[PDB]
Amino acid sequence: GSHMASMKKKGSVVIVGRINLSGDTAYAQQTRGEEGCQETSQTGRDKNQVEGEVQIVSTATQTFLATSINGVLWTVYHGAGTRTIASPKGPVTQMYTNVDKDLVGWQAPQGSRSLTPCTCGSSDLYLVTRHADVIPVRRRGDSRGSLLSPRPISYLKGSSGGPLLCPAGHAVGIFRTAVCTRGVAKAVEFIPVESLETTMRS
Ligand SMILES: CC(C)(C)[C@@H]1NC(=O)O[C@@H]2CCC[C@H]2OC/C=C/C(F)(F)c2nc3ccccc3nc2O[C@@H]2C[C@@H](C(=O)N[C@]3(C(=O)NS(=O)(=O)C4(C)CC4)C[C@H]3C(F)F)N(C2)C1=O
Ligand SMILES: [Zn+2]
């Protein structure tokens, strides 16, 4: 538009829940409902206590995941764009933005726990979805893995920004893309942790 005084502002990304990997069972928890999410997106002020490594996040129009690795909460550019994230003191600006990697990052929220970047060189991986499904994935390239059990894409939708982990629970990558045939996801692509570690200068 040409009328700046009425131009709107996009809201912040908001943490609305988490994937609980604390104990012996993985399960999703919601920490904020739709109304509070909308309000928090507009104000950027989120006083809710944050816990864990994998957050469920939402904008006004999308919901996906975000994962803390080495003190950074990482997600996909196609979900977050350039948006701030809501936090107790107001909106927090991205610390990393790389559209070429489909990647953004913010400082990890107080109370979150961070995954350690994997140095195992292991190719037996585990994708964690927004429904707390743990999906075996065989690493097939620097940024590619095949699902041991293919699944309709509906089962993976909304899980971009989630982790692929190694057998020891280290972060190997950030889920960003599915490779499908006739609506069935047979493979995934991810941002490898080394591409993050480069981004971080670790
Ligand atoms: C057909 C398909 C499966 C929808 C699509 N596959 C696909 O295109 O495969 C091609 C062929 C082989 C590799 C790949 O090359 C293109 C790479 C695309 C990309 F990913 F790098 C990407 N870079 C962007 C950068 C800037 C702006 C937009 C961008 N948009 C992109 O891709 C778009 C987004 C991505 C997506 O849906 N991700 C997931 C997800 O859950 N999102 S989400 O949470 O629901 C949500 C949309 C709320 C945020 C994990 C997959 C879940 F559904 F399984 N896409 C399309 C796909 O996966
Ligand atoms: Zn490892």
Curated annotation (Swiss-Prot):
Catalyzed reactions per annotation? Hydrolysis of four peptide bonds in the viral precursor polyprotein, commonly with Asp or Glu in the P6 position, Cys or Thr in P1 and Ser or Ala in P1'; a ribonucleoside 5'-triphosphate + H2O = a ribonucleoside 5'-diphosphate + phosphate + H(+); ATP + H2O = ADP + phosphate + H(+)
Q: Which residues form the Peptidase S29 domain?
A: 25-202
| Residue span of region NS3-binding | 12-21
Where, subcellularly, is it found? Host endoplasmic reticulum membrane
What cofactors are annotated for this protein? Zn(2+); Mg(2+)
* Residue positions binding Zn(2+) 1: 118, 120, 166, 170
Cofactor note (record)? Binds 1 zinc ion, which has a structural role. The magnesium ion is essential for the helicase activity.
The record places the active site at 78 (charge relay system), 102 (charge relay system), 160 (charge relay system)
Which spans of this chain does the record mark as coiled coil?
none
Q: How does it sit in the membrane?
A: Peripheral membrane protein
Its job: Displays three enzymatic activities: serine protease with a chymotrypsin-like fold, NTPase and RNA helicase. NS3 serine protease, in association with NS4A, is responsible for the cleavages of NS3-NS4A, NS4A-NS4B, NS4B-NS5A and NS5A-NS5B. The NS3/NS4A complex prevents phosphorylation of host IRF3, thus preventing the establishment of dsRNA induced antiviral state. The NS3/NS4A complex induces host amino acid transporter component SLC3A2, thus contributing to HCV propagation.
What information about domains appears in the record's comments?
Answer: The N-terminal one-third of serine protease/helicase NS3 contains the protease activity. This region contains a zinc atom that does not belong to the active site, but may play a structural rather than a catalytic role. This region is essential for the activity of protease NS2, maybe by contributing to the folding of the latter. The NTPase/helicase activity is located in the twothirds C-terminus of NS3, this domain contains the NTPase and RNA-binding regions.
Assembly with partners or alone: Interacts with protease NS2. Interacts with non-structural protein 4A; this interaction stabilizes the folding of NS3 serine protease. NS3-NS4A interaction is essential for NS3 activation and allows membrane anchorage of the latter. NS3/NS4A complex also prevents phosphorylation of host IRF3, thus preventing the establishment of dsRNA induced antiviral state. Interacts with host MAVS; this interaction leads to the cleavage and inhibition of host MAVS. Interacts with host TICAM1; this interaction leads to the cleavage and inhibition of host TICAM1.
Protein name (database record): Serine protease/helicase NS3
